[PDB]
């Protein structure tokens, strides 16, 4: 499913996103806008052979079991394609548990890259939340 910049955010805030670890919600529309373009079914593959899942776009090498990933460690432990479904609600509690981390939201490139240090309220300018 193709999200809505503001179905979006308030999807998020509902879910506990929305100043999650001191990241305002702006910073996780604006992540998801780039990894996936607000799509839950976007893949991609790696060139160390992990997959990347999901609107947040996770990766399979750490956080969830694509039963093709050498190696691998199910962190969040779900199959990495419960990521691909419409309710958020498994990328939300796997983001959860990878920005609390330690290295925060730079965890994700495109945030790290496009989002950092930008406008990111911007993203939820406009919505009923």
């Given at each position: 499913k193709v999200f809505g910049r503001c179905e979006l955010a308030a999807a998020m805030k509902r879910h506990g996103l929305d100043?999650?670890?001191?990241?305002?919600?702006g910073n996780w529309v604006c992540a998801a806008k780039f990894e996936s373009n607000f799509n839950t079914q976007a893949t991609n593959r790696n060139t160390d052979g992990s997959t990347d899942y999901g609107i947040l776009q996770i990766?399979?090498?750490?956080?969830?079991n694509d039963g093709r990933t050498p190696g691998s460690r199910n962190l969040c432990n779900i199959p990495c394609s419960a990521l691909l479904s419409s309710d958020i609600t498994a990328s939300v509690n796997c983001a959860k548990k990878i920005v609390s981390d330690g290295n925060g939201m730079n965890a994700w490139v495109?945030?790290?890259?496009?989002?950092?240090?930008?406008?990111?309220q911007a993203w939820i300018r406009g919505c009923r939340l």
């Open positions: 100043n999650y670890r001191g990241y305002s919600l990766n399979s090498r750490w956080w969830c495109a945030w790290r890259n496009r989002c950092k240090g930008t406008d990111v």
